[PDB]
From a paper:
Two related proteins Hda2 and Hda3 are essential for the activity of [name] both in vivo and in vitro. Together, they form the yeast [name] HDAC complex, which specifically deacetylates H2B and H3, with [name] homo-dimer as the catalytic subunit and Hda2-Hda3 hetero-dimer as the non-catalytic subunit. [name] contains an N-terminal catalytic HDAC domain and a C-terminal [name] domain.
To gain insight into the role of the C-terminal non-catalytic domain of [name] functioning in the deacetylation process, we determined the crystal structure of [name] domain of [name]. The structure was solved by the SAD method using the Se anomalous signal. The final model has been refined to 2.7 Å resolution and the details of the data collection and refinement statistics are summarized in Table 1. The [name] domain adopts an α/β sandwich architecture with an arm protruding outside. The protruded arm region spans residues 509–532, and contains a short α-helix (α2). As shown in Fig. 2A,B two symmetry-related [name] domain molecules come together to form an inverse “V” shape via the respective arm region. The ITC results show that all of these mutants could weaken the interaction between the [name] domain and histones, suggesting that the inverse “V” shape groove is indeed involved in interacting with histones and the residues His604, His608 and Arg609 are indispensable for binding to H3-H4.
Residue numbers in the entry:
A (entry chain A), B (entry chain A): 450 to 658, 664 to 698
Write the structure that this text describes.
Amino acid sequence: HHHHGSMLQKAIRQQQQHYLSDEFNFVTLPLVSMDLPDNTVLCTPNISESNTIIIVVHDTSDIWAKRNVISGTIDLSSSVIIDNSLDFIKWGLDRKYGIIDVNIPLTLFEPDNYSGMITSQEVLIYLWDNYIKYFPSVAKIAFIGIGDSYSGIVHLLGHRDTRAVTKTVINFLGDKQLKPLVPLVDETLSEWYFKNSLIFSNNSHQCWKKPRKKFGRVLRCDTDGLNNIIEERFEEATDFILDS
Amino acid sequence: HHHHGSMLQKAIRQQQQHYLSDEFNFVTLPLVSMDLPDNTVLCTPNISESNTIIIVVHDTSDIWAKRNVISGTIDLSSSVIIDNSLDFIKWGLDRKYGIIDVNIPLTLFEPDNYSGMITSQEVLIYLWDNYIKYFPSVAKIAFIGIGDSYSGIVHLLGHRDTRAVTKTVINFLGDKQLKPLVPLVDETLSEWYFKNSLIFSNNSHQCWKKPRKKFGRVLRCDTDGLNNIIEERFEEATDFILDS
């Protein structure tokens, strides 16, 4: 039986690309000279001329579907995309913010997602060095990282001076492993990162079973599951964003 | 939550198209002037110059995947295509037969698959009237219909004189409804159809809980599930094929 997991990852991002184009006319941010698909990064038009930007980073979205229990096969008509960034996108558009949506493919068929995290680091560095750094009108960025993909955000904070425009970082972690920030340029960054971040994790997390300050203010949600903790704490998150 | 079922149907057929091209260099049979995708019908090269053709008709393949039980989401790395026609394709290639593979999209989001069956009827009529009818070297066709898609086959038998080249029809039914053949051109066809068909259905089927001759020799397998009854009776099927 032939695996179908990679095809699915691309099918998911492509339907997302479709909705975001039809509904809010997003577009692609050519991440040329990297062997990643075009719709990896998507963004509001005239993003270059935007004041405030929300940048949402995530791994491929989950698919929920019922499953004929004994055949074990997936009910195609019940299949839906659980898009954890869509509500942040709609929230920011409704305040005329610039939106950047980054999609990082999961590393399937491997003990964990180390490699996906590395890709996340590389894409956010490309984004910052070739774009954004050359955005004239950008003032105030908020970063939202869903799942493992958040590694790319923390990496960028530590490997680029950034505090000129970065006002908030949010991480909806779930059951994933906490990402440390190890500053390279400035040690103040440790204190800044703790006072300007929210790291939302599953109630059932390994931690709390003592998180150190390099991790940046970890909070224990009352539920589990990325979708659940985002629903649970979307207001606390957006609240925290606006006060910066 | 946005449905994802249609995208999936196209993603499945497209990975199939990939394997069949890389592994046996299949190609597309332009079904022009119909608003169906290119990879609907796929076939061995030089099909026009083939003596014996196996024609395998099926609905979109199932996807099996484990599912994180409480989040309810699908394990992408465990996801696989359950391709019920692949073993017939490999069986026929290993005897140098011509292969034609027809894919009919399921009608998702509707009480049943009436519409898909109608599409199946239309594609096999297009195939027979614009192609095949004009194949010089074709002698001996066997039809294999998986699931509801078999309706297109029965329809063609009754709406076109066909017995010049059709030697066997096989239907791996499962739990679907039996397709009657109502001859239009010739009444002998009822007797021919019963003596030249095998209709394999699930042990748990509605029938046997008395099938009439218009249905063409229904057999009760010992298991349930298309994949299971094909595994169970692949030899009986191929056996029945060769004796014609």
